[PDB]
Each structure stands twice: as structure tokens, then as C-alpha cells.
Write a protein that binds this DNA or RNA. Sequence first.
RNA 1: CCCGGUGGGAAGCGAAGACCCCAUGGAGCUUUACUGCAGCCUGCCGUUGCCACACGGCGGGGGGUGCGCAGCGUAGGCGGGAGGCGUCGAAGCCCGGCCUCCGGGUCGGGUGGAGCCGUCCAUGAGACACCGCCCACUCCCCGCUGUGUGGCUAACCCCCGAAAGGGGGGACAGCGGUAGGUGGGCAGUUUGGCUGGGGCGGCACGCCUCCGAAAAGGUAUCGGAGGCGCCCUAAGGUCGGCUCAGGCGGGUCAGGAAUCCGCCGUAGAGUGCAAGGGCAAAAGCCGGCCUGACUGGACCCGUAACAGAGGCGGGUCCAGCCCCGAAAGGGUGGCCUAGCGAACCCCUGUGCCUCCCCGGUGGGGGCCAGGGAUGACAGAAAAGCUACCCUGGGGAUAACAGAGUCGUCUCGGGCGAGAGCCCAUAUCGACCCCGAGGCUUGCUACCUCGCUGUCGGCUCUUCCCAUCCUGGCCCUGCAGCAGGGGCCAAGGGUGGGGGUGUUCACCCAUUAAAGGGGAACGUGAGCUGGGUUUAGACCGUCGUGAGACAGGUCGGAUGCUA
RNA 2: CACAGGUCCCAGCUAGCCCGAAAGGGUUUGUACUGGGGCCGACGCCUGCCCAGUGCCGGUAUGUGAAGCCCGGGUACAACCGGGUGAAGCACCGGUAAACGGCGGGGGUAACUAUAACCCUCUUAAGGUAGCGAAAUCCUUGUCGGUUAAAUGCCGACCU
RNA 3: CAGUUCGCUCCCGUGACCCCGGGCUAGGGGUGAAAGGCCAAUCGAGGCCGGAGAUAGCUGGUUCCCGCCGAAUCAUCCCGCAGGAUGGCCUCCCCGGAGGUAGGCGGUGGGGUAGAGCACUGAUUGGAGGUGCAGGGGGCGAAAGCCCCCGGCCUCCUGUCAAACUCCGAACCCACCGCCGCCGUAGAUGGGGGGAGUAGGGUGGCGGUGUAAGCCGUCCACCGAGAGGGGAACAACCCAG
RNA 4: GGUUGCACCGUCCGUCUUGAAACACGGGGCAGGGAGUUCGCGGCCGUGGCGAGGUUAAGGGGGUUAAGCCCCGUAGCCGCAGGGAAACCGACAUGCCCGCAGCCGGGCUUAUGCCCGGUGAGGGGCGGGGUGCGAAAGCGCCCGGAGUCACGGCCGCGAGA
RNA 5: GGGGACCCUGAGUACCGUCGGUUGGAUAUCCGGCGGGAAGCUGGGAGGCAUCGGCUCCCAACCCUAAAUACGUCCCGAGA
RNA 6: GGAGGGGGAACGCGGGGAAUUGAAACAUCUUAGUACCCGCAGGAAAAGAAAGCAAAAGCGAUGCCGUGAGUAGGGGCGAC
RNA 7: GCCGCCGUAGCUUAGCUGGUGGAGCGCCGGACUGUUAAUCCGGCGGUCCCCGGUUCGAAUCCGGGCGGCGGCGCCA
RNA 8: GGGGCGGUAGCUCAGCCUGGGAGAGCACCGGACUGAAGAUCCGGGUGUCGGGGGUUCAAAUCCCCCCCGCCCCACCA
Lengths: 94, 239
Amino acid sequence: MKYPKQIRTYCPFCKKHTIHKVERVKKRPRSELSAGQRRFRRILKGYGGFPRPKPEGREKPVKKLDLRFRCTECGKAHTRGRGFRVKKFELVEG
Amino acid sequence: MGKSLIQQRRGKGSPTFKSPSHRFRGAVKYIPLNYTQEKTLRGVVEEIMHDPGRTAPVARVKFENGIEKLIIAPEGLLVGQEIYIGPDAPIAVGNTLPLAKIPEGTYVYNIEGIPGDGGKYVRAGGTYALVVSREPDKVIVQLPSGELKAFNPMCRATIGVVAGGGRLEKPLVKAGKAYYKYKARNKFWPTPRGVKMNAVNHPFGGKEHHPGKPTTTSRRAPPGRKVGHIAARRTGRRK
RNA sequence: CCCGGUGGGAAGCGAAGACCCCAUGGAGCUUUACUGCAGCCUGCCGUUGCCACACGGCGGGGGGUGCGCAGCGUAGGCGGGAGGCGUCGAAGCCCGGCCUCCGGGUCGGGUGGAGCCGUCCAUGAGACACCGCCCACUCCCCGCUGUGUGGCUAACCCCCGAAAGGGGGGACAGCGGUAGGUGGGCAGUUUGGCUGGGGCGGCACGCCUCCGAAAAGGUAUCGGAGGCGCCCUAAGGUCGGCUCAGGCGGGUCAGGAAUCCGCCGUAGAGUGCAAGGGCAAAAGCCGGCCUGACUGGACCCGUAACAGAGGCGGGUCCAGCCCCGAAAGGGUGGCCUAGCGAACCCCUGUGCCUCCCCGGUGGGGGCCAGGGAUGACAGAAAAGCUACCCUGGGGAUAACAGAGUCGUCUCGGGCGAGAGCCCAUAUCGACCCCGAGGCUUGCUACCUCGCUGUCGGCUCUUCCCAUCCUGGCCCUGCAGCAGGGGCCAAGGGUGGGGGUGUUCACCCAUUAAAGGGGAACGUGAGCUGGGUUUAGACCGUCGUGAGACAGGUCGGAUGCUA
RNA sequence: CACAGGUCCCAGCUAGCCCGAAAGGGUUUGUACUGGGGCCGACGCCUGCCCAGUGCCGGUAUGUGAAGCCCGGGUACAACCGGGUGAAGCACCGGUAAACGGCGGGGGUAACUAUAACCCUCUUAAGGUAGCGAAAUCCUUGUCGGUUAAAUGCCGACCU
RNA sequence: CAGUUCGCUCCCGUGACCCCGGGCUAGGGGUGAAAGGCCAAUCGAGGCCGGAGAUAGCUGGUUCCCGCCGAAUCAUCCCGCAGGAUGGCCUCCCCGGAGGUAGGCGGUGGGGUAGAGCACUGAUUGGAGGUGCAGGGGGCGAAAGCCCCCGGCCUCCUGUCAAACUCCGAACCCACCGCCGCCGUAGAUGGGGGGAGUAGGGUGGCGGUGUAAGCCGUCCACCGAGAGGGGAACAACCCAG
RNA sequence: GGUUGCACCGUCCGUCUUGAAACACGGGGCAGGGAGUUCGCGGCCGUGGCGAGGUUAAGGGGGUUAAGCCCCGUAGCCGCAGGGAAACCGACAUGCCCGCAGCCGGGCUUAUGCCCGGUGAGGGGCGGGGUGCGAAAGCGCCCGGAGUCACGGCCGCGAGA
RNA sequence: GGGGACCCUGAGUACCGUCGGUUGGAUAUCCGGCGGGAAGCUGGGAGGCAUCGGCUCCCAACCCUAAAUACGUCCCGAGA
RNA sequence: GGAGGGGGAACGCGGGGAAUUGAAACAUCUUAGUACCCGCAGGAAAAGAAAGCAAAAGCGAUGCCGUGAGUAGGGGCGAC
RNA sequence: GCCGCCGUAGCUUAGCUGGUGGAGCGCCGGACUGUUAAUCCGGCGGUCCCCGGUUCGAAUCCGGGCGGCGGCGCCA
RNA sequence: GGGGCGGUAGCUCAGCCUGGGAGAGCACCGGACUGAAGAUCCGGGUGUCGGGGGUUCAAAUCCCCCCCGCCCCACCA
């Protein structure tokens, strides 16, 4: 839901308390670059096997939570279990 | 899926779909090895015969260099008419000369499309091409379809009209008489419809009378699926 | 024992049932199923040449052009910088070329012939003092390179000719190679499972609650009620204070609300959300502070009782880092029980290993964790038709007949409200209640799917009575003649025609009366073969289409020597 | 079923369509009175209306649209990342039903009882027209009439 | 007679007719006046050979004897329910080594089914007496009036009974201990290893659904896989192993 | 022993099946033919050699008529140390306690046998150890020498199986 | 044997880029096709990604090759 | 003047190239470069004197057998 | 018997996140008109079908009910 | 997810690149105009103009993050 932009929580790295900053994950592109790109070979004339992959989903009435928590002081993030399901995630302002 | 269709058989050159060539009569040649310029050449109508597969009458002509070849017969020809070939041929009916040498606004047939290839245009019963305009650059001739094609001025053609007009004026009468004509020519018949042909036989139409998918077909459609109204721009007779 | 006859039985012989279901069977066919593949369109490269033109992009120089608004006025930007300019020839008159917002600046001719500017200030930002580089549109000679159009002819191609040579067209096209698009023309396949057989429909296919559930535990059905596939960063955490729905009496109002005071008040309130369970000096209410819904690594339980079982959840420790509270002490998220997601892949984040003699760099692999889907929910990537079917099987399962059953069906009994002129019961009989049969329908799946041949009809024969006539009787609202109603009784009788494929039923005229039901819904190794449900065809409806229909309709074989 | 007749469609022959792995080939000793493909199915009278949806066709500024090349970035090179350039194709516009197909519902009202020539309303492009009709229409043996003594028939009629 | 025939009857019988010989077109191909017809007793894709001993969760069959023990037809998971795997269960071998606890009594615990009822959650039947009140009918109604009046909303003694109610609550099942019994040092109880088998039926009890028979649970003697004796016979009743 | 009368009892066989004498399926009769097989690999079992090692395969010498066996070859496999993905590191030929068998002691019954105390290999339970994860802790796996080869068979999988 | 440029030293090849086929071949197989395309031993390739340096090895694009190894037509010998 | 064609028991070398099946479905994968088809040679073929190998150390043609090893490696990273 | 969908001013129809309510038509009162029609101003009624529930409040969102509309009523 | 376009006064949008307190027509209220009605003119206002934040004195379009619709692609272990 609405979540505070900053919230005081445990930093693994500093191993001591500091104020952490919340962002939001984001999709990179593919394309060199992967086992899946290495999968582009497979698909000669005829079918791929895997490279034929799904036919359509989708997309699960919720979302799950996808966050980054950054220590202010060192600047280094740590990830937590998500699966804390949220429709929407809003950050507020201070 | 289904068998090759009625049209796909045709293309093989298999014998049900092979024209007879042994009951059929000569083709038109004008012969350009004695050229148009420096002419030498007159001939005499040796006989007139009916050609079966043209569905038109055709002339045997006896040339005076000693070669015998057919020329597609003009209307109002006599046996013992003299036909001339060249530009210094008289300007009259049945005489053959280049388009430039032929007046504008006179009816003409048996027009060349490449000089000296013997007639590849207007060689059907009673129909005729009109010379609408002539310029030394190109001579434009108006075809049986109403449609204007530009030809080289040094094409040959014969003055007059083809004989054997009224051809579709008279009807074919019955299925018997018609059967008789198709043997004389080549045209796969009796020809039934796809609509009560089984799904295997034909792309449209099932067991009973009704069409499958639309009759109207693409211009990029496959072989063996290009049946119906082919690439129809319009259809019907209404707004 | 034998002969002859007719075929009643031998669920007689000919069949591993075409009907139906099931099988991760097959095949044909269809399509806007899935995925591929010819053909066609189309860009690019090679084939592939010459002139011009116009034109896109660089690349070098250049060259006019800059109304925020005050305003001396058209301040385009910063910075060096208030002085640069002026015989290193100025105003200010007279025109010429000029773009343009005709706002007004720029500029070559010449008259001249010795000054002009801002500092000053206004202006959100100051100089048409000057010096640099720019950011505007824009235009152009030259150097490179694309693209479009036309001309040419030397490749190449279509015609003619034995050849020589010429004609039409031309870097188009054609061919080779590749890219994208279209593409059931062609090919491979799939199209689940649950199930009162199966299909529509529903899904009880994942999961939560009470019950069913038999007072430990387990525990099923398309088993009852009725939900979750999110919401919440406070609706958490800790701590202090605090007690409620509703009702009463006083208050305000039309009443009533919110608001007010007192009294009653063990839970009817509330606690996000089903249900159930938990709870009153609280887990509820209010307020403050705070962010443990933290990191690491275990035990144990559930999942999946006992009893193997993945993912997931939880209780319960201990270490580390904080929080709160005076402290004890608590916090492994929301009082509990729904809010569930794999291998592989990819992306994320941190720290660490590694990449073939060796070092360095790029770009990789890997260990760990988080996040992204499979709701057919322990995860295939996925539409239909088949009466043209085919196969493996099954009576583990439909149609038919039988059995069982008996809601329905038929018949019968009790009670007797009430009507029949008075009079329940001559007759008629509601409400309600109880039986018999197996003759209609339905339920069942016991038998049968290596075939017990469907109906109807015809023909032939037996049986049953709850009896239509006939005989013998009782009552009567039985005068007669004629009825109504009841008993005995199957010995005999119970027909002929018209429509319909019709068992039934409708009608006609007769008749004493023209009763009902059973026998593989009697009767196909007897006939008949019209109808039902093959393969041909048509119409209507439906469907994109194949194709379908217990919709209508014409036609559609009836084996065998006992 | 063919069928004569009718219509729609395509192609200027160096075609269109079709066959072929390819070379090449059928039509074709063929050239629009041809010859190829569908639809309908002699004659007689006719053939309404709709381009919304499907399909086909023509076109497409604009958006969009691959590989190639170009430019920018990256890499001592390369992978790679980004943008322009982006053809057919798509979005988009028009035509087109003798192309596939569609061609609706309620209410209220007339000397009198009936109905409604009449008038409202709305979907979704249009709203069943000439005809024919209880049909090679469920209910149903409609109803009436013919026909039969008697006809779930046939025939004629009405026709919702 | 015939793996498509016979007679009568019937259609055509100068033709889009019939016929002979030659010759052409071959299997997703031909050919079709188009029926999915025909292409050599074979056609909704011919035949031959090879792949090929295809593969089938599916039918059938699987052969000497004797001795000993002797089942399950359930559970979870599964494009899975006509099948697999893994447990329970059955059976075989080995290991360690002193207890094990089917039966009954007592002690200490667990419990909401029979039954029963008003004590809640709380459905409902019926009339008295309170007249505590929100309002649809009437009246002197001089008018929401002062005053009574009638559906009625809820106390009281009473009044019907309540899968998914409970003030209560058996018999009865079950955890542990002690005791006795029994069972074990000819080795139990427990552990490891090898081999299977995953259609049930059925009376009765208790059910759930369903008019019912039947379905589906559950425990159940028994049948399966168990004779013999008896119930006339009679899978599962009785007697009996 | 053959045959038959008499008493008593008995509705084939096989298979399907919950139930078959069956109106479920199969069979005229008889003769012959006819179905758990081979290789590789894994998991078991019995038995045998050798021994912290063990075994050869391929091979050529040799012998023989040929050939097996004999002796020779030791490549390779597994075992002898493990853990960790990898980098990379690297452990108990015994410290403690029960106790089966047996041995040792006492008591007891005529005897076998029994009851009770040491000692206790084998076995059972701790501690300390190696390594991985790891700031740490706590677990994961491992730790005080038995295997290898051989032969028969059971069973799995791939193969027509 | 050592003395100068050492002999020049194989082309559509090596290699690069685009599509397949195939293979175990992974970025790191091999072979084709399409487009581009070297070097003159003062040189080139190879050591399982690319590139640069060291280090070690070796000369493709010309050709042939006994023997040891396959078979069962034929002969002989052999048989749980 | 000299040659070619066609045959040949299997083997050999070079080309073309499936599917039933397996993955309990099936498309990549698998069957498998198998079946089948074309060209061709001999008595053996082919390969063959390194532009090799790569325990970096050590080797100096090539077949073949054992083994490496069911190892590395490929693959719905599933079956294989 | 199954599975969708309605009812809204006298009629017919828009509409709804739960805080609303209209249009055309009829009807009624004035006004043009000689009268009237047409035309022209002014209007109003809706528990938004019944009946539960949640909510602070339901016309709206769920339960149930009633009448009206389509689609299956079969291969067997 | 990538690319592009449009979301603005009650309504439909105009002003991207082409910058300011800023817009236009139509609904709607008022005034002209005709015997009548209508149409057609003249007034009136309804958005710093999609949210939130930044550069600008002043920005709808510029910038950083976006909601929603729309169209073309790519993509779903």
C-alpha cells in the first residue's frame, strides 16, 4: 500500500541501524546474453523445442511486492523476502 | 487435406487437358527473313479452310518465293485474290503492310508486337483493332477490349477485319452440339460446380448446396485456392 | 429305434456388436486451434554499366536573420570587459540593392567633413563600447555518400535467322542469397480430467469454516451453509490509561441525529473480510513511541494422522543487530484458522570462486537470495467434425428386452367434510390416510456389447381377471321399458371398415357385446419391412467452416440343407 | 448430377491461370466472337434493401514496420546497447452483396363487440420488398371447404 | 449356376450411343455428367517389398510335483483413476538383544454422540394478566390536544419443539501408569536388506443421500482365497476352521 | 484287475469375474509344435580365493594335433580419507561409559541348568576431531583399516525383452 | 660446412560477416552456400571465448602410400 | 591406335535421406545419419609422415583392439 | 428441470463508484386560433418489481421470491 | 516492456517542433431580428489550460516521475 519512503530497519552490511530508502525493481532487456540467447541457435528450420515457449499466460490477479532497501549511510541495498502480496505499492513523501 | 483441384490437373499437360495438334491447322507466319523493306513478295489464295481450334476460317497462301504458309483469312476474300506483303503492298483489304504505312482511322488486324514474329495479336473471328493515332515515335492501336497498347511502328498488320463474325450471335443449342464443339477444341467438360463437391474435392462447398468461405479470392492466394472470382475489384451490378 | 413334416427350444449356425462408453488408439475432413512448410508480395546484397537532373545526409570555409515586458530600443546566451570608435577618416543630408515582425537593421554610390557611445539608470537577466565561441531559420561554391526520375547501350533476357547478322526491351526484369509479411495450398499434431454412461450445464480440479462425522484420532459422495485468491506499514510491535452493544430517567428536536448527565448492563459490542474458535482491569477502545513484515542458522509440526510425500506455512531456540517499556519482559508481521506456486530460464542484489601454457582487459560460467508463470492450482506449449469411419476392449458403462424398484401408472381399502327434495353412505364425494399389482413412465446397472435381431402389422397358439356380453344374483332416488351402483363367474363370445408406420387414439355403420393385460413391450433359423437409427438427396434452423438435428422429407438387402 | 440459357471475375500474349526439385512445361498450330475460374441452372415474369461484420479490391500524408546500411555509444577488436533511415504488412480512407451473409422488437388507438388502416419507442448496417405460405407450422388430426358412409391423408383456401 | 446370377416386367436402341485394336495419364497422384465413386475378387488415399519381432496402460495364452507361510483390492501423488510410483499390508534373509503389552481392574487424564432441555446462539405455535412503547383504524373528537380505543413492539406465570443450539450429559472410544494376565533369552520387541500384489462383494450395526432399490462412508462376522454339517436347493444365515 | 448292479455324494474344464453349472468367453477328437530368453548396467543374496590391497583386459612369448589349463603382460578399475559447486582444506591404529557372547569368581539343584560380581572383542551411547556454511553460533556430510576379484541366482532398466 | 637479398614457398585459400546442415563440440565441431577478403618465411598457423604481451609447438591451401584391422563366395578342421 | 560402359557373396568409400517409436500426450529432442535410394573402387579400402598433440610435462605417420568412460560434454537441461 | 437477462414518472426507455434521477409519449392548467387541430409556454407523480442482508446510508452490491426474454431439453 | 499519438472550459477539441495573464465553435443564461417560429448575429462566464514535482519572471507543448485510452511491435520461467 502506501509505505513510508524512509523507514529505520536492519542493514546486514553495517550490521547496525540506519534509515533505509525504498525503491522499486524494473525489467532489463535481454539480448546478447544468456543461455537463452545461446538458445537462439537451436531454432533451425523446423521447431526449436524450448524456443517455442508458452503460448500465452497470464497475469495473476495481485502483484507481489518487489523492493530494494538501501542503507543511507553506506549506500548499499539489501533484498528481503517479498511474497508479501500487494495490489499496488505507493511511496509517500516526508 | 484434399486432392489437387480441376485447374491443377490442367497444368500438367496430361492428355485429357492436352489440345489435339494433328487435327489442327497452321499458324500465322509472315516471315521476316525476306524483310519488310526491299520487299519482293506477293502471293495467291491457294484455298480456304476452316481451322478447328481457332473457331474461325483460315487461308492457305502460296507465295511467289515458293513457300506455302497460312495467313488468318480476312472478310470478303476470293480464292485467287492476291495478297501482298511489304510496305509497297497496295493499301487495300487483305494486303499486309507496316502500321506507319497504314492510314489512321482504318480498321486493321493481325498486328505484330515485336517486328517479325508473325502475328501475335488480333487473330479471332470477326473482331478488329482500330488505328486511333499514329506518330513516327510509336503507333497506338486500340484493341478488342477497348484498351490502348503502344506498338512499334514497324510492326506488320493486315488491312480489314477477320472473317467468321456472328460467331457467338448464333447459340450452341444443346448439350450434344456443344459436346461436339469441345472435342473440336479442347475444354474440360462436362464441368460441374464445387458447391455440392465434397470438402476433399474443392475448397468451398460441402455436401449440400451452400458456399464455405467467400468466393472472392486474393492476388497473393495460394495455388489450388485461387478459385472463384479472382482478385475481384467489384462484383454485382448495384451500388 | 426308424421315417416323414414344421419349425417351439437348444438365449442353434454365420460376428471378437456398425449402436454406446473408455483408451493420454488410429484415420479422413475443417478452421480466425497450436506449430511448421510451398507460392505470392516486398526491402537488401551479388549479377550490375555510362550521362545527366533533382534531392537527403555528412564534412570545410562562409554568408543575411534574432519585436519577454519597461525601452533612449528588435537587450537571443554567457564571460574577458566601461571604454572602444573616429586623416587606422565620424555624424547628418540624397538614392541605389536588402531581408523582414512593413518591429526596424543591414548594406554598396555619393554630399560631407570631426564626432559618436555608456558609465548614468530603468529592465526578472545589459549594452546596437568592443572581443570570443555559440544556440535560431536559413541559403550557397566546393569534397564524400545515399536515395528518386529520365536518356544511353556493353552485361543479361524475349524474337527472327543453319550461320552471318538484326529486332524489342535494358541494368528494370530474369537468376543466386537473405530479411519481413501474407499463406490449411501442404504436413505434423492436439483439442484434458471430474461425471449416478456420456454431452450441454456445473467443477465440489487449489484452498478456508461449521456440519455430515458414529462424545479420542481417521473419515466419502455434482454431500448442507457459505467463503479466499486480497487488504493493512497501522488494521504491526510495545507501553499507559480505559470498558461495551442495548435499555431507563433528566436534556435538545416535529421526531430524530450528533452532542450531554446519571443508572442498569458478563459480552448481545468489537476484533478488515466466511464461518467457527479466542478474549473485558483485553487481543477491544484511546494516546504516545516505534518500525523484528530484521539477519543467520537450527529443532519440530503441518503439508501427507497412523505411514513414504515436493513446494509452501507455522510453533519453538540460540547467535547478531535494533525497538519499546521503569522493569520484568516482549517482538521469528496482522488473536487463530483462507489470501497457495516447482525443475529450467531470465532479471536483481551482495560478497565470493572460476573461464582450457600465462598475465591484463572485455564479455562469460557458478555458489546464494529476491522477483517475473504454469488458477486443469506436485507446473504439457494445444480448436472442431466424423451417419465415410476404422481399432483395441468393456456389460467395470448408455440404447433395447428381462430382473430389482414402484416416485408415476392401474386398481383397491379406511375416515367421512359436504351435495342428493327432506336424507353422508341410491348416487355423487373434498381434505387426509393405508394397501395390492406390475399394464405406463422414471430410477437402477444385476445380466448381455466373440450380434438373447427394433416397432408396428400379419399369421398361430396359451394364459390372467380387477368381467364388455352371455348365465345366476343384491341395492336403488328399482313403476314399465331403460339405467346407476355392487357380487358370483373365464365355459364361450368380444367383429368389419375409413385416416395414421402406429401399438394408443379419432370416426362410421353394425352388433348381445364390439372388455383390458401378460407370453424374448408373444410371434424376423414364419412372413411383411411401412416406420426407428447406415451409407444418396432436399428444405428449415444452427454453425466461419467442416458439419449437425429423436425437425420435416423421398429412397434405401431381410442369410442357414435340423 | 450434367445440361442449353443467364451473370460475376482475371489477363494485352515478354499476359493471366495452372504444372515442374530444376531445366522447363500445359493452355497454344490458342490471342479478348479468346481462354481461364466461379455462381446459377431450359423458357415466361422477375431479381427489393444493406459495405455494420467477413471477404476482395484500390490507395495511403501520418504512426507503426525487419534485416541491411548509417550515425552515436561500447569493445585496444568483437559481442552489445541506442536512434534515424523503416519496404510489403498493420492501423487509416473509399468502392464493392447475380462476394459470404443479414433483412427487428414492445406498448396505445376507429359509429359497437372485434381488429387496427393510425401513432408513439429503441437496437445494430439495413428492416422482408415482388412473391409464395399450416410448405419436401412445432403445438396439430389448426380451421373451413372439397373429397370418403366414415379419410391423423390429398387437394384448395385462410395464413399470425 | 453365379464371391453380384436367373426369368417376367421395364429404360435406351442414329445417338451427349455402343464396340475393337493401338496409345496416354499412377498413389495425397490420376480420373470423376462429382457418388468420396473408380484406378486388376484390395480405395474417405491401390498393391508389393522393406522399416518390422512398431507399439498398445489393451484381449487371449504362459506348460513338473511336493512342503511352509500366506495377502491387499486402501492411502497420497499423477493430462490421473481399465495405469504407474510410493507407503499400509504379505512374504523371505540377516542383525542387535530384554522386554513387548491384543485382554481385564484401578488410578490419573481426554471427549458433547445417545439421551435431555431452556441456559446461550436462537428459530418458531397459542391464548390470559402487565398496559412500559415506536403507529395502520375510531370517537367527546375545538383537533399531534386533555381521554379511551383496536394489527401491533417487548416483560410475566404459562404454550409447541428446534442436524449445522446447549445449563447438562451417558453407555462408549482413547492417552499413561501400576498390577495381574499373556508373551520372550529355542531371541521376542526393534533395525537393515530382497520379492510382490493399488476392479472388491457382502449381512448386520451406525449412518449420509435417495419415495425406494441403489450409491457413497464406517465397523463388522464372512465370501474373495475355506471344505464339511444344517437352512429344500441357494458366494457370503447357522454350526465348523 | 474288467465290467456292471446297488447305497451315498457330486450342476465340466479353463478363463473373465464381486459372483460362472450358466442363457459370459473358448474348445469336434487325437498327435506333434508351442511361450520367463541374451548382452550390458545397477541393486541384492549365497558361496570361494586373496588380502590393505585386489583383479588383470588388450597382447605376444610358450605348450598342444588343436586347444583349455599352466607361467609371463598390471594398461585400467575399484578399494585404501573425506568434504566442498569450485578455490581449496584435510580427521580418533582410542579419552569416557553400558553390555551380548564367552572367560573369570561365589552360591545353588542329582545333573543339565539357575541367581548374583568382575572382565568384556563384536555391538550400543558420549566426548574430542576433519570439512562446508559461517563475524559467531548452530547444523550438513565425514572420522579409531576392509575390500577387491570370482561363481550361481533373484530383481530393475535399455534393448523385440 | 659458413658468406650478402637466405630459397618466396601453393587464393578466392586463410580469415570475417550472413543462412543452414551436423556433431558431443559447449562463445570453444565439422562441412556447404551467400557476401567480403591476407601475407612474399623481414612470413603464417596452432596451444578448446575475444583482444594485446610473453612462452612452447608446427607449416594449410599440390600428390601417393605396404603392413597390422572388414567379409564369409570357398576349403578344411570344431561343437554343454 | 588405346579405352568406357555392365556384373560381383559381403565388406569399403562418397553422395540423398524417413517414419512407426521413445519422451507413457507431442512440435524441439529421440529413432538416426538408422531404414531405403544414387555414384564408384579393390582385394582390402580409407587414413597416413603434423599448419598434430598440450596431465606445459613429455611425443614425433596412420589404422585397429582394450581402455579412457557411460567420463567431459550436449539436451522441454526432460527423456536420452 | 437447467444456464443468461429484466422491471425506472400513466407507457416506453436512458442511468447508478451505493449519497443521484431523466428524456420522448400520455395527462393537466394557461396561450395562439373564430373554434380546433397542429403550435406554444407551466407542471407534476418514480418506496427506480417483492422481500431479506451489509452499510453510517442501497434505486445502485450481494440472498431469496414473482412475472416477462432468449438458449438445452439430446448421440441415447 | 519498447516506440509513437490523444487526453484541456459542461462538450468536442485548437495552440507539439511554432514559449507569456492566454484559446475556438457547440450546449447553457441574456440582448438583436421577423406577424409568427427557426436559423443568423451581439454579450456572459465555466481550464495558467490531465497529476505531481523541476528550469524560466512568466511554459499546455521543455525537464524528472507518471494515470488512462489508443495503435504497431516485442514477450510470458
